[PDB]
Amino acid sequence: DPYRNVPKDMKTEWKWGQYSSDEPSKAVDGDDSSQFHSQDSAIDKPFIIDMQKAYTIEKLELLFRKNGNGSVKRAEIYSSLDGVTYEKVFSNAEGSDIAPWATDGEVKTINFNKPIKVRYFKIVTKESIGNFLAMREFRPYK
Ligand SMILES: [Ca+2]
Ligand SMILES: [Mg+2]
């Protein structure tokens, strides 16, 4: 299956509430239709995914809401082994050389130039429709 190398039983950490039933766990439930949707502005707030174990990750796929509140245009992504010290591994924030994402609901892929040993990912929304984060799926690949 195409997702054989996506870690199972990822856990999430979000401290600022959800909209309706769109809970943080729905960003990593393997269902492209279900989503996390923040209750309020997610700008500069960390959405953390704990893979439970360190893996050498080769790429990320992110899937956001299509054309509505929470569709992400720009974000920074950080990685950590210990959950304290994070290093930036991706940015399409203003000033970077990477274009903002279209709000088209299609998979956004980040292919790492070399695999990175990581346990935790932190996603920091920098620009999004309505300032929310609405993330249908986050998939790191071993
Ligand atoms: Ca989902
Ligand atoms: Mg690997």
Author numbering: 954 to 1095
From the paper:
In addition to the N-terminal glycoside hydrolase family 31 catalytic module, CpGH31 comprises two fibronectin-type III modules, three CBM32s, a putative cohesin module, and a bacterial immunoglobulin-like 2 module.
When mapped onto the apo-CBM32-1 structure, the four regions formed a contiguous site localized to variable loops located at the apex of the CBM, comprising an aromatic residue (Tyr972) and several polar residues (Gln971, Asp975, Ser973, His990, Gln992, Asp993, and Asn1022), consistent with previously identified CBM32 carbohydrate-bindings sites. However, the secondary aromatic residue (Tyr1774) and binding site histidine (His1671) of the CBM32-3:GalNAc complex described above are structurally conserved with corresponding residues in the binding site of CBM32-1 (Phe1085 and His990, respectively). The other tyrosine residues implicated in both binding sites (Tyr972 in CBM32-1 and Tyr1674 in CBM32-3) are oriented similarly despite being located on different variable loops.
